[PDB]
Amino acid sequence: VFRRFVEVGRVAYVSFGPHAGKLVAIVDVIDQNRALVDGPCTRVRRQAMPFKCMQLTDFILKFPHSARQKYVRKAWEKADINTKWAATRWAKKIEARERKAKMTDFDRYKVMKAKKMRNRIIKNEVKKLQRAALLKAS
């Protein structure tokens, strides 16, 4: 069963292309595989985008199918998409990947030295839990 639909007003993340990594808002549907789109609050001019470069998100902000950038914008700020997107776990793991790619030599050394002890502690206490299971089985 489908939950995300292409109608007027749905916002969508752009995965690849020139405006990759930015949100947009669907303004109109041109044909089977192309939509007139505009992200006013996120540095994306009104244009046409194929649907296959866009991947839908579960946010809908309401405006008429031919409204101007003024009204698309007012909808965007009154629905404060820029904060909800950052609050979503999708953007959290996006920025997690970006930070991981951003790491350097010294800080990856720090990560290695940290997760070494973290894994040691976890492994020891897991062994403790296993022997607890054995003793209560006995």
Binding site: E98, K110, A114, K115, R118, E125, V126, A133
Partner: protein, 199 residues
């Protein structure tokens, strides 16, 4: 260093195309469970094709002519052989470093089998198109071991299910463990999060 591929859900020639170049480049490829390889086009078409290949035969002395291997693994192996330059010693070395099996033998039933999405049926075929199964085709053109392989495969499946449930119990224990000892490991979770290893 050994690349173990699973054969279920793949397309025969489109997978052999990847495997041939990979083997020519020096990798040791082990394709496993070839009775699940699919082929585009309906079953009657595919079996007519294989029966024409079967009719191909040397009139004077058939024992010298083309060899019509019936096992699915051997069909896949001969496809890769056709894609490789088998008449040269480099191609022969490639053939030697390729290995193919039906079912999943004990050398490899305890290993993580990869998958090649470029040659995968769900990716490369429209849902409305018909296809066929190499195991069924081989059985109907002469393979004599479809049932035995099926029983051995189901046995392997219960053993793997036991192992999987053990793994799940272990990792649930581990997550219980970390949410037990978060207070003592909190000084490292933050330094992982700040570089994007967690969440």
């Amino acid at each position: 260093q050994v690349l173990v591929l699973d054969g279920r859900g793949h397309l025969l020639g489109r997978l052999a195309a990847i495997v041939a170049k990979q083997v020519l480049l020096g990798r040791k490829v082990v394709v496993v469970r070839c009775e699940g390889i699919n082929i585009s086009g309906n079953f009657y078409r595919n079996k007519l094709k294989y029966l024409a290949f079967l009719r191909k035969r040397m009139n004077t002395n058939p024992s010298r002519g083309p060899y019509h291997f019936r096992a699915p693994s051997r069909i896949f192996w001969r496809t890769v052989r056709g894609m490789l330059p088998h008449k040269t010693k480099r191609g022969q070395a490639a053939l030697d470093r390729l290995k193919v099996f039906d079912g999943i033998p004990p050398p490899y039933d305890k290993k993580k089998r990869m998958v090649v999405p470029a040659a995968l049926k769900v990716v490369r075929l429209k849902p409305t198109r018909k296809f066929a199964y190499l195991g069924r085709l081989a059985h109907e053109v002469g393979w004599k071991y479809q049932a035995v392989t099926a029983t051995l495969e189901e046995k392997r499946k219960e053993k793997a299910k036991i192992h999987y449930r053990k793994k799940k119990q272990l990792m649930r224990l581990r997550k219980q463990a970390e949410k037990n000892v978060e207070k003592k490991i909190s000084k490292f979770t933050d330094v992982l999060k700040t570089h994007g290893l967690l969440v």
